[PDB]
Amino acid sequence: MAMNGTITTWFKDKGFGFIKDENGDNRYFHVIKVANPDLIKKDAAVTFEPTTNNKGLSAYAVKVVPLEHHHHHH
């Protein structure tokens, strides 16, 4: 459950985006399902577990690769 991919579309207003699976499956992940802060996003690299729409399989512990920089907020 540790695969690499990239963000193809992102809806920050809706709090999720779309990522292409190594398996060729195009599926969406939610900022809540991301282990890294929802305040940190970048399309240049993601690591995630394979999943489907929330009608079948669920997703959790998604990791987005940082740019060696972050900020702390309340």
UniProtKB/TrEMBL annotation:
Domain CSD: start-end pairs: 2-64
Protein's name in the database: Cold-shock protein
Residue span relative to the full protein: 1 to 66 of 160
